[PDB]
Design a protein around this nucleic acid. Sequence first.
RNA 1: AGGAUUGAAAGGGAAUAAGAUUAAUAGUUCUUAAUCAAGAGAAUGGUAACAUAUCAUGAACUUUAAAAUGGAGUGUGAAAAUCUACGGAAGAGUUCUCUUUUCUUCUUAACAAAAGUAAAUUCCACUGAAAUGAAUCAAUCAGAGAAGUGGAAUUUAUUGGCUUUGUAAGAAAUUCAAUGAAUUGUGGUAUUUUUGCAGUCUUCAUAAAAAUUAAAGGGAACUUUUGCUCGUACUAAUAACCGCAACAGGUCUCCAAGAAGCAAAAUCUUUAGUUAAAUAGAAUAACGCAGGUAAGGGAAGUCGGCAACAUAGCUCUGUAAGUUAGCAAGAAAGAGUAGCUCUGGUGAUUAUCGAAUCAGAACUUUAAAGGUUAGGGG
RNA 2: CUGUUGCUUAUAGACGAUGGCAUCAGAAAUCGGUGUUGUAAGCUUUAGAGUUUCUUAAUCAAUACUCUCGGGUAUUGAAUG
Lengths: 73, 150, 93, 50, 50
Amino acid sequence: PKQVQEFKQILKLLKSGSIRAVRVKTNGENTKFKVRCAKYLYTYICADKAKAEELKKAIPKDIHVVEIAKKAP
Amino acid sequence: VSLKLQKRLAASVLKCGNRKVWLDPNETPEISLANSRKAIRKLIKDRLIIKKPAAMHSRARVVERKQAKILGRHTGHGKRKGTKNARTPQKTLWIIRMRVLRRLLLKYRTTGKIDKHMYHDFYLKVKGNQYKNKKALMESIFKALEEKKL
Amino acid sequence: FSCTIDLTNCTDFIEPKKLVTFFRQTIKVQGRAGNTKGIEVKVADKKVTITTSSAKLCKRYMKYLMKKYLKKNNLREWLRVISDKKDGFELKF
Amino acid sequence: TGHKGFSYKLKLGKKIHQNRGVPQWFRMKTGNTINYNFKRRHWNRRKMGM
Amino acid sequence: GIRSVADRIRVRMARLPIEGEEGKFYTLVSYVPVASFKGLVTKTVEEAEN
RNA sequence: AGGAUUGAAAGGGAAUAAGAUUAAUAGUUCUUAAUCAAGAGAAUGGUAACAUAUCAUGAACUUUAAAAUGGAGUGUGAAAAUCUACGGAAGAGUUCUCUUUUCUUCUUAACAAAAGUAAAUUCCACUGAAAUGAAUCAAUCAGAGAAGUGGAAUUUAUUGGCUUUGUAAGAAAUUCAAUGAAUUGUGGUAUUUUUGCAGUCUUCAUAAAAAUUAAAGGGAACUUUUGCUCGUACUAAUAACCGCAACAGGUCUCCAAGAAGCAAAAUCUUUAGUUAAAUAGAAUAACGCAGGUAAGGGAAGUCGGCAACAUAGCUCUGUAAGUUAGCAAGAAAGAGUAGCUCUGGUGAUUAUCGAAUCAGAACUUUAAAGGUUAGGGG
RNA sequence: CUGUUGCUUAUAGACGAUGGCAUCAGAAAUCGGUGUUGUAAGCUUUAGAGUUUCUUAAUCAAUACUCUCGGGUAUUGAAUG
């Protein structure tokens, strides 16, 4: 598992067609957009809720998006 | 009816020994029908099978002893069974002695109280076991500094 | 710091006014008994709260004393102290 | 043992297959004196030595 | 422990009918803790209550 | 081209972990997360040590290195266990006598990232040491160049050693309610184990080979596919092995809590295992096996102090003849040792904080190593 | 009439034997007598050498007097009621 560090690559990565599925976990303070690519699992830890919303609109409709909470699916 | 099968399984499910498993004595007909782990995992939630707590091992007796030994309540002569060097090694009382002294010598030389030529005649003097403790070295430095200005 | 005692269903067994006197006379803060000058227990009717910030007190101390009183009048068997996970204690059967 | 070669495991497998008694229907034939297997053994009585 | 037993024990027995047939009786030796054994005699306890 | 076959389930070796499941199998299955091999789709920077998410061409022939190597003792970095300091959250135990009390849980992988930050060693650049210095517990080092300042590389249980981060809380542990809810800070100049590093010591002992891999000298010309065969149950022993057997015999290894002590000693307990392991009840004769004690004398017993008894730990004082000068020596001999309340000495940072260790003084008693372990001497 | 059985039977005893009693039986406690050990548990004697403190009191404190010739044990193979 790898971690992306800022908005530049995460937005670029989602637009690419290699993405298999996307998971978002909503913790008490932050949120991780654990996108799952062909090989690794990249996650961006966002603390600003406004910056997560623009990330929540960038996912293409052709992949499965699962929103997790304090209860596992 | 023998409940060996129903007790071994509940040891692996609860992650505890066979001695910590508690099967209800009043519910023998109900427990005896649980021949699979999926049945045993439902009895545990029904509290027909619980996990006994560990026996209490209080360290209150030992702590009051160590507290008393700090004040030297028991450190007598008839409460020692070992040699003087065994309880207090002679090497580690001197390894620490120099590390206490040679750190002070470097501290003064770095600070600028003494010079390299004086710190050299004090490095060997400490090495030869002339100064017994730290206090008896700062006194000698204080003494040998006054003879310098004459 | 605050701590509350829930007596909403055990009030028949324990009169809440009785606990008020017991806590002020048995709570120790610096080492004596009955020296709850800085600690107030008041009434609060159906519940009992300490809510004192002038003394070094702990939540588990209340459970120690609450279990201590439950054995004073042989009431431990029928009751059981359970925390409500929201800065307070509650009693069940 | 834990580690047995292939030609050794299949010979053990035959020695547990042969350690079986007479089938019930066989003994009910006519003039059938084969009532018990006298080539039998056990793990704690006779080590098969192999 | 097994190496010691109380010097004096004040027990209480009760002849009762068995659960199955009332014609056969059985005893139940209870236990009666006592602070001291001074003045304690073999006393026949009779409740006679409703 | 240089020499054939076999020879190690303890030597060498490309690559995997956590949670969960079964009446039993799981580094083998399920979920999640990875890794390896074989494919398929003629460059810069730094004075220098040297450095750049494959990059930045590199054939024949040759060389170097790794794989690849004794032991002893000391010091130290790191992790785990145990102990402990501050602050807590949840539950359990005692309570007529007290105890802000005693106990349990508070965790995290393979593989990767670089907020912060270490110890040791070897090198590079500036200057050139004498009034010689630098340093370790010990050493050891310097004009074929010490100390000082600034740098570079490598080791430290995967990347980069420790904290931290993705994995990852959604898992797990502890609780509450009848599937749904709560929490998971920070330290230590403490003991042990494990694993590395540094030099020191010892040999008329110098303590393996190849597969396989990388570099140099030389200049010839991101995705996807596959990973076949064999073992995998169970005991590993006071009942699964060898002894004719459920034989007090024999049989190679890994993991390792508290009290106490110098000690992995004897004795008691926690996690774990068991209460059955060639049948029991009654009576309490002789003669027995095993374990003991004794008046007065103390080897008179007997082949013979056989057996048994007695000295025993530690501190201080003292210690002969002889001698290969090293030893004899724990020679022999004598004094002390408990409990409680105190005092002082041994350090780090600028008053606080931490360690068991030594010494001394009052007062009391049943006058103190002796429950266990534990030299008889000449 | 004797034997068995009972008092987990003694004045006897390896087992048998022997001796006593068998409903005026027998056993069990309890209360005395008689012994063994040495002053029980709770609180008090600023007893108590000192330390700590409130800051000029309490706390802790081996041991230690009062209640205490106290408590505990006493047939099991002891003797009365």
